[PDB]
RNA sequence: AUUCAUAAUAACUUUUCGAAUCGCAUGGCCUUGUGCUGGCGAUGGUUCAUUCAAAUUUCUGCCCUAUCAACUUUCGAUGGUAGGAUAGUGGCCUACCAUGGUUUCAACGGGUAACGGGGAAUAAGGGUUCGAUUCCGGAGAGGGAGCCUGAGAAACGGCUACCACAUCCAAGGAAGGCAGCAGGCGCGCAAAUUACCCAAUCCUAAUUCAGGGAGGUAGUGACAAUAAAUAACGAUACAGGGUCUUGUAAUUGGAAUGAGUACAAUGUAAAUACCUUAACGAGGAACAAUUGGAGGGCAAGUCUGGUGCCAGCAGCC
RNA sequence: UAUCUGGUUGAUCCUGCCAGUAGUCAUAUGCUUGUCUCAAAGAUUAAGCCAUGCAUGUCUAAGUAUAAGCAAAUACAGUGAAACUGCGAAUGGCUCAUUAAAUCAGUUAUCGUUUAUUUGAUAGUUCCUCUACAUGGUAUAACUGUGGUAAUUCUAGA
């Protein structure tokens, strides 16, 4: 393969969020696919963007290969890129960390078990220790 | 509690199922154009039935009715854009006089046979299914593509599909592989 | 059913929001405010489905709650604050001003305006009354009430509230020879001049309105909104100036558009 | 259109409301007191308007039944006055008084395998049949009644009592309500996972942040619906129509390609699958298509073979 | 868009009904099953009975903090369990048993009324012929520690 080409269309400036929104389309006549991080770096060197401050999220390849169309947006000043952005995408680009939590059933069971305790249960714990002691 | 996606059916079974003239004409069409079953003839008959019903209740409306003007102009412009009527037959009595062959002539397999490139309509269809035709730039593998009158000059082979070059297929690849492996050394 | 209603499903939203019937099974449900939800436009619909600024619901939540979008010169944070007709929604970080004026076809439009003229707003005075403690007060269609008006402001008429402290400036009468917007029913979004008003005691004084192109029609008086002298409206009219083209010449101008 | 809005007088009231609340800012004045004053907001607050609603309400419109022709008024049925009660109109109730009200233009009664509508099937029309079910409206949480709180409930993922079920036991007492999501038993001709998540659409809350079996995503899934793989071309030899065209053959040749396998990347909340694609993947018992039919309706046998009987010919064929 | 064909039928003609044909966003069931998009689904008999899990909770600069909680301005100041306070829990979602002028649809009415919330306006008058206004008083939870009950989201007393 010789090259892909990335064209940005319908560019909208959104100063309400300090960002620019656009529809990327890439012509990759040979390779297979997009290699999305290469597009992030390419859009970084297109405007001036420091590629950890960009995010392209929507992508789908046209029928019969070659053309892939998606939606992508650039934030200036990567602090706002961490600010006005959903957490799943920031984890997806490695600029955040996924928290681990128990699954929905365990959380619901724990909430509906400590709905049966009034107060801290320190009196209940002390009382049950004393009352099964003798 | 979410809306329905609407749906319908494009084919229509005939009223008298078993008529030797009808079976003969259906099979004649199937041989002359290379169809898979009788559903294609049924589907074109349903499309034609809708068009003729629209034409009938448009003509029962008076001349120079604005609804007649707008809907008839849209219908005639559409059916000349797809290229079933001719260029100089832009009147409703002609679109009453349409035949099923005038619609099957404008398909994809009929055009990719008539324009050369296939030498047989059955070979034309199987060459469509194997993803070998670009209309404009787009690979298509529906035989019933119903190509427009304008895009007739852009049917060719794809960037893939070794008739269009770009790295011949798997069988020839294995063939040259054993020529290099056994006959080569 | 035991109380009020808080949900509004898709297929039950106002049709002129142009909400896609798939991709979601609920509609914004404009919360209570100045306008009826059947004839309003929430902030989320305006900012999400018209200017394409936000993409989700939380996106416009984060746009609003940074204290950006002001309706009538006052900061709103609610996603479904019902911005209605003749409202003057403004955006600070882009230095842009807007005015909700109905499109010719019937739904809401996005009418850009200068920074001047965005500091006033017309309102159809709907009932004038001697209020508490003997003061007179008018109340208009947008829920505003104004105390001590001029005695010549009568019912079904138009006043001009600016934005600053109310304090109604020069106002309009209501008779023949006055430009008129229409905001309801089949003849919605159509601008013309009153030629005649027939008063039926018992209800629904129909109005005869003649447009720019001599297509007369009638509406009920509830939909009439007088906007000033013929040829001199005090606002900027939307694109096309409200003519209601028939579909045949709509086809004509639309293929006239095609080709360069 | 008013005894309307509003104003005034005389009073009256277990005298309602008229800020003892909170965050962020450090401005200004001089008699320099830690004196005076002052911003940007938050939360309340009486009344009126507005919005969200609510409740009553005018006209007109429903399926079958006359083997339903009289019905309602003892115990309100229709009307008057006055009171009570309600958010309020009103026989809504009470006291008193009138004798009315509906109907062959079908009252009243009975039946419904009846929730109503937008709508669905049915293409000459009008019609005939359906509408439990994605939207609008009503009713109900095993049956009834009653009720607290609250702006809003005669609420049942609130309470009390009774009835029918039924659980737990230390036998003294206690606790229930899937016609929410799964799922179980039963019933049937007849109907799916005790999965993942709030990423989307929205909703609630003091609230950008939490929560949501609402909803979405996957699993089962031939309810239904859309598009169309199971082969294509050549060469040889004959059969033809006839020097170019079709058919046949245990004749032959190389092409093409996805069903599948799968690096990868897109996709996604995370995944699966689709879109793209590295590499592999077709020579027939392969990667093999079935379901119905053949006297006429109604399309296609002047087929083949086998079994059983004959008081029929032959004689064991 | 508008075609019908067999049984009665012994030779004919009609009345006539039966059968055959086709559609179903109409249920079930049999055989077979490769692909892509799309996706209804315990309604019908039992509004029958339910094991277990989950389905309603909520915090900002802005009501209450001495958690003998976690960190890191001598009243407090950061974060932040429990509990008080405020709000919501009357929306959803499910089902179709009841219901025959009842519901419901279109169309009016409220000069016959209730409405938290949202939006807009709105309140120099208060005890007063001896007085906190540079600010009145009580409790009570949470908490500490003392206990019962087989058991309950039981709670007793300090």
Curated annotation (Swiss-Prot), chain A:
GO terms for biological process: cytoplasmic translation; maturation of SSU-rRNA from tricistronic rRNA transcript (SSU-rRNA, 5.8S rRNA, LSU-rRNA). There is a cross-link at residue 20 (Glycyl lysine isopeptide (Lys-Gly) (interchain with G-Cter in ubiquitin)). Disulfide bonds: none annotated. The modification N-acetylserine is found at residue 1. It is found in: Cytoplasm. GO terms for molecular function: structural constituent of ribosome. The modification Phosphoserine is found at residues 13, 55. The keyword Aminoacyl-tRNA synthetase does not apply. Component of the small ribosomal subunit (SSU). Mature yeast ribosomes consist of a small (40S) and a large (60S) subunit. The 40S small subunit contains 1 molecule of ribosomal RNA (18S rRNA) and 33 different proteins (encoded by 57 genes). The large 60S subunit contains 3 rRNA molecules (25S, 5.8S and 5S rRNA) and 46 different proteins (encoded by 81 genes). This is Small ribosomal subunit protein eS24A. It comes from Saccharomyces cerevisiae (strain ATCC 204508 / S288c) (Baker's yeast). The lineage of its organism: Eukaryota, Fungi, Dikarya, Ascomycota, Saccharomycotina.
From Swiss-Prot, chain B:
Its main location: cytoplasm. Residues 159-185 are annotated as: Disordered. Residues 106-180 form the S4 RNA-binding domain. It comes from the Eukaryota. One of its GO terms (cellular component) is nucleolus. SMART domains: Ribosomal_S4, S4. Component of the ribosome, a large ribonucleoprotein complex responsible for the synthesis of proteins in the cell. The small ribosomal subunit (SSU) binds messenger RNAs (mRNAs) and translates the encoded message by selecting cognate aminoacyl-transfer RNA (tRNA) molecules. The large subunit (LSU) contains the ribosomal catalytic site termed the peptidyl transferase center (PTC), which catalyzes the formation of peptide bonds, thereby polymerizing the amino acids delivered by tRNAs into a polypeptide chain. Component of the small ribosomal subunit (SSU). Mature yeast ribosomes consist of a small (40S) and a large (60S) subunit. The 40S small subunit contains 1 molecule of ribosomal RNA (18S rRNA) and 33 different proteins (encoded by 57 genes). The large 60S subunit contains 3 rRNA molecules (25S, 5.8S and 5S rRNA) and 46 different proteins (encoded by 81 genes). Interacts with snoRNA U3. uS11 interacts with MPP10. Component of the ribosomal small subunit (SSU) processome composed of at least 40 protein subunits and snoRNA U3. This is Small ribosomal subunit protein uS4A. It comes from Saccharomyces cerevisiae (strain ATCC 204508 / S288c) (Baker's yeast).
UniProtKB/Swiss-Prot annotation, chain C:
The keyword rRNA-binding applies. It is found in: Cytoplasm. One of its GO terms (molecular function) is RNA binding. Component of the small ribosomal subunit (SSU). Mature yeast ribosomes consist of a small (40S) and a large (60S) subunit. The 40S small subunit contains 1 molecule of ribosomal RNA (18S rRNA) and 33 different proteins (encoded by 57 genes). The large 60S subunit contains 3 rRNA molecules (25S, 5.8S and 5S rRNA) and 46 different proteins (encoded by 81 genes). The keyword Cytoplasm applies. This is Small ribosomal subunit protein eS4A. Residues 41-104 form the S4 RNA-binding domain. It comes from the Eukaryota. The lineage of its organism: Eukaryota, Fungi, Dikarya, Ascomycota, Saccharomycotina. Its main location: cytoplasm. The modification Phosphoserine is found at residues 31, 246. There is a cross-link at residues 61, 133, 160, 167, 173, 178, 210, 232 (Glycyl lysine isopeptide (Lys-Gly) (interchain with G-Cter in ubiquitin)). It comes from Saccharomyces cerevisiae (strain ATCC 204508 / S288c) (Baker's yeast). One of its GO terms (biological process) is cytoplasmic translation. The modification Phosphothreonine is found at residue 114. Belongs to the eukaryotic ribosomal protein eS4 family. Keywords: Cytoplasm, Isopeptide bond, Phosphoprotein, Ribonucleoprotein, Ribosomal protein, RNA-binding, rRNA-binding, Ubl conjugation. Pfam families: 40S_S4_C (PF16121), KOW (PF00467), Ribosomal_S4e (PF00900), RS4NT (PF08071), S4 (PF01479). Present with 573 molecules/cell in log phase SD medium. Component of the ribosome, a large ribonucleoprotein complex responsible for the synthesis of proteins in the cell. The small ribosomal subunit (SSU) binds messenger RNAs (mRNAs) and translates the encoded message by selecting cognate aminoacyl-transfer RNA (tRNA) molecules. The large subunit (LSU) contains the ribosomal catalytic site termed the peptidyl transferase center (PTC), which catalyzes the formation of peptide bonds, thereby polymerizing the amino acids delivered by tRNAs into a polypeptide chain. GO terms for cellular component: 90S preribosome; cytoplasm; cytosol; cytosolic small ribosomal subunit.
């Amino acid at each position: 393969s010789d090259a892909v080409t990335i064209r940005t269309r319908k560019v909208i400036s959104n100063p309400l969020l300090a960002r620019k929104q656009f529809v990327v389309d890439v012509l990759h006549p040979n390779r297979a696919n997009v290699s999305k991080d290469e597009l992030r770096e390419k859009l970084a060197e297109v405007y001036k963007a420091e590629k950890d401050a960009v995010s392209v999220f929507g992508f789908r390849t046209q029928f019969g290969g070659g053309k892939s169309v998606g939606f992508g947006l650039v934030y200036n000043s990567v602090a706002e890129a961490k600010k006005f952005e959903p957490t799943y995408r920031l984890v997806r680009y490695g600029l955040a960390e996924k928290v681990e939590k128990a699954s929905r059933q365990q959380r619901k069971q724990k909430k509906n078990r400590d709905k049966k305790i009034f107060g801290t249960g320190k009196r209940l714990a002390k009382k049950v220790a004393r009352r099964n002691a003798d | 509690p979410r809306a329905p996606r609407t749906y319908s059916k494009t084919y229509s079974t005939p009223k008298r199922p078993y008529e030797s003239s009808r079976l003969d004409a259906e099979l004649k069409l199937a041989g002359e154009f290379g169809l898979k079953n009788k559903k294609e003839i049924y589907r074109i008959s349903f499309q034609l039935s809708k068009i003729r019903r629209a034409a009938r209740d448009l003509l029962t409306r008076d001349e120079k009715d604005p609804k007649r003007l707008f809907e008839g102009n849209a219908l005639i412009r559409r059916l000349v854009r797809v290229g079933v009527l001719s260029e100089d037959k832009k009147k409703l009595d002609y679109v009453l006089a349409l035949k099923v062959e005038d619609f099957l002539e404008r398909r994809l397999q009929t055009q990719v046979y008539k324009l050369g490139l296939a030498k047989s309509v059955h070979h034309a269809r199987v060459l469509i299914t194997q993803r070998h035709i670009a209309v404009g730039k787009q690979i298509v593998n529906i035989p019933s593509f119903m190509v427009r009158l304008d895009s007739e000059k852009h049917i060719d082979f794809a960037p893939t599909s070794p008739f269009g070059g770009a790295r011949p297929g798997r069988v020839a690849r294995r063939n040259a592989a054993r020529k290099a492996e056994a006959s080569g050394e | 059913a035991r109380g009020p209603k808080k949900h509004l499903k898709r297929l039950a939203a106002p049709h002129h929001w142009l909400l896609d019937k798939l991709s979601g099974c609920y509609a914004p449900r404009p919360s209570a405010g100045p306008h009826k939800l059947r004839e309003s436009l929430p902030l989320i619909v305006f900012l999400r489905n018209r200017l394409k600024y936000a993409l989700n619901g939380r996106e416009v939540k984060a746009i609003l709650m940074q204290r950006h979008v002001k309706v009538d010169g006052k900061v709103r944070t609610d996603t479904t604050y019902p911005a209605g007709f003749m409202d003057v929604i403004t955006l600070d970080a882009t230095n842009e001003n807007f005015r909700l004026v109905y499109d010719v076809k019937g739904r809401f439009a996005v009418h850009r305006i200068t920074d001047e003229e965005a500091s006033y707003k017309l309102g159809k005075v709907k009932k004038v009354q001697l209020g508490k403690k003997g003061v007179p007060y008018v109340v208009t269609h947008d829920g505003r009430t104004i105390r001590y008006p001029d005695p010549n402001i009568k019912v079904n008429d138009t006043v001009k509230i600016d934005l600053a402290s109310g304090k109604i400036t020069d106002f309009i009468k209501f008779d023949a020879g006055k430009l008129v917007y229409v905001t309801g029913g089949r003849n919605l979004g159509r601008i013309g001049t009153i030629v005649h008003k027939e008063r039926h005691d018992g209800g629904f004084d129909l109005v005869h309105i003649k447009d720019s192109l001599d297509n007369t029609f009638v509406t009920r008086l509830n939909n009439v909104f007088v906007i000033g002298e013929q040829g001199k409206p005090y606002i900027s009219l939307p694109k096309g100036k409200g003519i209601k083209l028939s579909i045949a010449e709509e086809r004509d101008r639309r293929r006239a558009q095609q080709g360069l």
